Amino acid sequence: GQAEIKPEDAPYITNAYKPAYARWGFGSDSVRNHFIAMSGEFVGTFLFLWSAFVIAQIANQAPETPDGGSNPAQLIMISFGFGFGVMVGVFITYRVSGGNLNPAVTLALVLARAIPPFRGILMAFTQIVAGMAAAGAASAMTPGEIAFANALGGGASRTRGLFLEAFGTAILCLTVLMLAVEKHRATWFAPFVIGIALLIAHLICIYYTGAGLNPARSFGPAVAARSFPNYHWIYWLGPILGAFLAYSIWQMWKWLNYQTTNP
Amino acid sequence: GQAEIKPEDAPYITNAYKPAYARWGFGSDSVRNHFIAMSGEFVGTFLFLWSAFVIAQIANQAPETPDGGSNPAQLIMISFGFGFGVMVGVFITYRVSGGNLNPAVTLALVLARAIPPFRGILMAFTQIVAGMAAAGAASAMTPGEIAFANALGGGASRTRGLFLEAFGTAILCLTVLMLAVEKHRATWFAPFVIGIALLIAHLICIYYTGAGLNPARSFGPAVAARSFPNYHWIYWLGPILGAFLAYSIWQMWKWLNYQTTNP
Amino acid sequence: GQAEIKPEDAPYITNAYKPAYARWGFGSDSVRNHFIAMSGEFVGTFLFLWSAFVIAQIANQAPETPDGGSNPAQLIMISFGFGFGVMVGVFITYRVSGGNLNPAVTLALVLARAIPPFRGILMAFTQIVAGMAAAGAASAMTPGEIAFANALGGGASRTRGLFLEAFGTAILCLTVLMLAVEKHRATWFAPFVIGIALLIAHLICIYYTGAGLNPARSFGPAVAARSFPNYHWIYWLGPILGAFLAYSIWQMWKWLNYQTTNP
């Protein structure tokens, strides 16, 4: 009735592939543990954003599309850079820091009480510094003017851009909450679903807002380009609103004990 | 012969990642449980269709292709919006409502007796309202005329469109039946396969019918655009026929005890 | 040291997601079991090839590329139709017939003794009839001349085409052998890897041979178009050689007891 597990194969069963924040209980507030979490967020955010910035730099060397029209292949390439970039970053750092790689994701998880506030602030600070470093590195490593900073486009107003950013970020954060924070037989696979959520959010937003969805992603290139549009606030308030919306939905489902027919 | 499961990791084993309908037994008819199912279908259908509508809006800003020709990159982008959009929606809501997000899928599951008729009707109503909301939101958040409503194209007749919709929907529903409704070691992964099935169905249908495959997807934009083509019925009858075809195939396999060599 | 499995969740553990051929032992030669296998191959091959034929029909409505050049977006779309089409077909039919959907795959598995010769012949016959049906249906459901039949292109000779088909088919068959036929913790996931293998084989072959890789795929459209090129034999001999090459590699590894350090 049972299948044998050879001793040498036990680690593949005993070592759960779960986000680090799931096991941040007593003992977590050591300098060692804060450093581990910061190092995961730094390495993960740097590799994700650096990759995606260079990919966007390249995609934006495509010949101009007339009459402000869209270029689907270009948008797909950029969406792959961020979606698959984050997927790889999260898979790498899942057991180091949980792979948030995004202050808005960290905010949603602080609201959900998956991550305590101080650790959350440390992680968010680390992500922003990593975004600055990634933007500086991508700039230094590519020819031409920086083409990976966020800006409104496609005829979108600031108000439309704000909403697009908020809803796009909500999809991302709700994915992290339901797949990574909730504990079940698919938690291990959350980094994939998270990557696809960000891919979709880019297909929604790049054409209209450049796709911020992540204050660390938006801030870094603005620093490197020495250019902040006056509507830069949409790349902070939008994702913040998105985090709160995702948290609210998750919280309603938690209050309802959603996963259980007869609680 | 056994591998140890640490107590803190038990939830990743004990909490099955299974569609909510699999555990809708005694106790399911409470107002609480009807609300949970409706909330999953609403949130899931809204996020999926809103995302996919904005993505289609953008893709359809590509320069016109001469002589009625196809634009593969454009079709790929739209197919990603719906296929990956549904994938994310289903992964998020799998343990809330089962993530049908489509009245034709719900119909197939009512025929299969996976979901009872009244709950099915509630879910289908919820999906249609969510589709209306998504269409209204996508319209309000994007510039220009609505470009995400379904219409015949590529020289396809209504009769050809009806068949394409029926067969495309059958592929989707048969995927849900064999991967999500059938209970096995891949049930947890059904949301991925479901997303790929919808991706393929879009590559089949967008050019010719706009790809309905989902009455809630077709109805919402028609309301928002205040425009119903006289052939709008193909987006209802087609998916209905597809649900019946998928159900029929599944039912034959169930009668045959397909999964067992010696029943 | 153990994690509890709730009784209602046991089916997700006890019901292995494994190819049907893995459990075709004593009792398999009943009319019922032959019919089940044929029905899986028919439904799976029809849905896969019908989908992929319509997708290719659409992709080939793209404006002509000058000077015989390639169109990467077009090639990607067609490769998705076949790669994701087969992925969905195999996931649906894995526990019905094993989801070969390809006489060359069945041949490799007959050589490997995973499927007995008579059952193999029945399956191969079924796949060819399903390919004819799919080609007829795709033709009837789409406007214009059939654009999904295989032909040499891109300046490739018959001899080059033969080799491309053989190597492409070998990649496909070796994937099925190592992921689906070999029994391990990734067998359940083989349909995904199989789909990606076919996706790659299409990116290799479409431009030069139209990508046969499957005698049932090549034969059906030729019948529907009432057109057989004199080099049609490359779409039979190529995949046959590929099946033998994959089998040979697998057989060497089996003789070597590849998976065990100290046999």
Add this chain to the structure above:
Amino acid sequence: GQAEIKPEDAPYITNAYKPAYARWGFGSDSVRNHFIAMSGEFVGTFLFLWSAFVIAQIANQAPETPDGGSNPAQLIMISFGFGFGVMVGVFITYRVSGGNLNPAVTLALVLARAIPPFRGILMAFTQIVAGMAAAGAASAMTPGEIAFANALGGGASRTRGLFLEAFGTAILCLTVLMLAVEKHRATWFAPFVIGIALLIAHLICIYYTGAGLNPARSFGPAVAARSFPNYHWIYWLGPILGAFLAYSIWQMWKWLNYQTTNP
């Protein structure tokens, strides 16, 4: 509290899907075992690189983009050839050799002490010979001049190219280290994540360096084309630096006992 495993299904549980190097302990230095490892690296590297070379050959038949601009669809196609090509190669050979398919990956794993130096050298030699064979085969099987050799482009300097190659290779090697070398419930899935990492690294590098990321990938086509650019060294030093960077990050995390809150 437990779910039954039928005896015929035990192999899907007992046979771990783990990289071969994980079980190269006592007994590994036999001629048989060296041959098994070499055969996995040869077959895997040949199929991966041959596929990707033909796909790149085809993608590079696209009409020229004016003013040195990028072609996103072309870059996506090439990135799929290498990313999905390696994914398939690694899935096939995971239990044969571990599926390194890349001297830089092998170097990272020798540094990490996952593979001993002599076996590592044998594997690296095998990969280079397989790359030469793949380049020769791809050349012989395709018309026109070889279009799959690495070269600088997009206005990138040798110094920028070196850094892009190093960082891109680091992402690849860190993925292998954290997903395949580290033992946990996602180790079986590493071939997927590895493939996506290489896909991303191609979106970063193709436009600027042709994307080497693998000395065996760069050397083979140079031999077949009888052409070595004077900056060919970037395709050796870059990936070597990337392997060392990935190793360094992993080693820091190992020293920190990253995966454990209270060591």
